[PDB]
């Protein structure tokens, strides 16, 4: 006889601060380096895949997930929180914008559902916030290319470049200098790889590096070369071999 509990696990403090949220801000800091660059001409997201036994593999791990075909997401914070959140987020996006619509969700609108979920878990006791902050990078035809940031509270903000994970401020500061105005998507990949090189040390391989762009949708990414019937992915992960070429080219 149980399920009578609903007293909150997130309370106000005497500085009007929120206890769990302070705790969770650390969790993000103890993560690994992930970045985003919007080139206007696309979006590039990259992270370090790292793993917790030498016998494990990080080639068979993933830290970018497809949320819907044309949108991919990445995080800094704790692995468990990220997996349950991605699943719930994938569920609402299908149900409410492809059974009520048929066009894949505009990006910002998808951000608002992820944000609502995370805040909902903060209001209500017997659940606690998710301990993670996302950069959800997408494309939509009526927005163009987009980049959003979701904070662990549930708060959002747009950015045209940002960085998260260890040495967050300093990584972001580096982007400001190396990239101004509008430059290419290609060129921004070259930059993103360098920026990710300076954060990390002791791994430099393309089997521990994952870089993906949202920047093209080919029949090759459509799974059929016939006449289109849906938009299909605009998400594309660049190969371990592909990553390796570009490190040499810095």
């Amino acid at each position: 006889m149980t399920d009578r509990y609903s007293f909150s696990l997130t309370t106000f403090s005497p500085s009007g601060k929120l206890g769990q949220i302070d705790y969770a801000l650390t969790a993000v800091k103890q993560g690994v380096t992930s970045l985003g660059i919007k080139a206007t001409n696309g979006v590039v997201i990259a992270t370090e895949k790292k793993s917790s036994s030498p016998l494990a593999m990080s080639e068979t791990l993933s830290k970018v997930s497809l949320l819907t075909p044309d949108i991919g997401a990445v995080y800094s914070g704790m692995g468990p929180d990220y997996r349950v959140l991605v699943d719930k987020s994938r569920k609402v996006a299908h149900t409410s914008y492809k059974r009520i619509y048929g066009e894949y969700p505009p990006t910002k609108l998808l951000v608002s559902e992820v944000a609502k979920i995370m805040q909902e878990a903060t209001q209500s006791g017997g659940v606690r916030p998710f301990g993670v902050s996302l950069l959800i990078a997408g494309h939509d035809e009526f927005n163009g290319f987009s980049l959003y940031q979701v904070d662990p509270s549930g708060s959002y903000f747009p950015w045209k470049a940002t960085a998260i994970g260890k040495g967050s401020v300093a990584a972001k500061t580096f982007l400001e200098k190396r990239w101004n105005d509008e430059l290419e998507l290609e060129d921004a990949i070259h930059i993103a790889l360098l920026t990710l090189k300076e954060s990390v040390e002791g791994e430099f391989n393309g089997d521990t590096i994952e870089l993906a762009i949202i920047g093209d949708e080919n029949p090759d990414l459509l799974g059929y070369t016939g006449i289109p019937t849906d938009k299909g992915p605009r998400f594309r992960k660049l190969t371990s071999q592909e990553i390796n070429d570009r490190l040499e080219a810095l």
Binding site: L66, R90, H94, G223, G226, I227, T229, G232
Partner: protein, 223 residues
């Protein structure tokens, strides 16, 4: 309509005609009867227009949700089972006669589904109003050592038999080749073989016989 599915030793062809009728009068020369579920699981549907399309989108959604969840290809047998459990709950209220086809890493497959709730596995299957005339062609000319060119060519012949002898069928024929080895080909309007119901010509209207009681203008606006 006439919907068919034909197995070859390298892939599967489904095909359909795209004519929607209200009486003998042709409402639509084009509406897809071939619906995409995932890039390589295509489904043909016959019967009542509204029902086949809606069910196919619900399943279509649940399968894509599945594919992302497992980080693996979707199986044809998942789509099959979702379809069966949906018909069963609603006890026949869904009136979808479906031909579900797919290619996976497990091989090429061909099944059909009645609204009545029974599924079958076949080497070739057909459904529709053109079902009798087409299934006749397909059983006779199907052979061992079937190939791509032979499977398209047979598939054209099928739809055509149903056009000719069911005169509620007609209009363009859309074909979809799904190969295990190479990226599937949706062939919109692969044949353009029949036309619109009868016209006699029409001509300009004199303005001493068309009169206006009053008129205004107005404008579209959005805040």
């Amino acid at each position: 309509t006439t919907i068919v599915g034909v197995k070859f030793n390298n892939g599967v062809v489904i095909a359909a005609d795209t004519r929607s009728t209200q009486g003998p009068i042709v409402a639509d020369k084009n509406c897809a009867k071939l619906h995409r579920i995932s890039p390589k699981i295509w489904c043909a549907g016959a019967g009542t227009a509204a029902d086949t399309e809606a069910v196919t989108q619900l399943i279509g959604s649940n399968i894509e949700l599945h594919s992302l969840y497992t980080s693996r290809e979707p199986r044809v047998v998942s789509a099959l089972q979702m379809l069966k459990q949906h018909l069963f709950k609603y006890q026949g209220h869904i009136g979808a006669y479906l031909i579900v086809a797919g290619v996976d890493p497990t091989g090429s497959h061909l099944f059909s589904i009645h609204a009545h709730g029974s599924t079958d596995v076949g080497y070739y299957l057909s459904l529709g109003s053109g079902s009798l005339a087409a299934m006749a062609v397909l059983e006779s000319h199907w052979k061992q050592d079937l190939t791509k060119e032979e499977a398209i060519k047979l598939a054209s012949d099928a739809i055509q038999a149903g056009i000719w002898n069911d005169l509620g069928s007609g209009s363009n024929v859309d074909v979809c080749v799904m190969e295990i080895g190479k990226d599937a080909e949706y062939l919109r309007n692969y044949l353009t073989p029949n036309v619109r119901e009868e016209k006699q010509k029409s001509y300009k209207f004199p303005r001493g016989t068309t009169a206006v009681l009053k008129e205004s203008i107005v404008n579209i606006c959005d805040i």
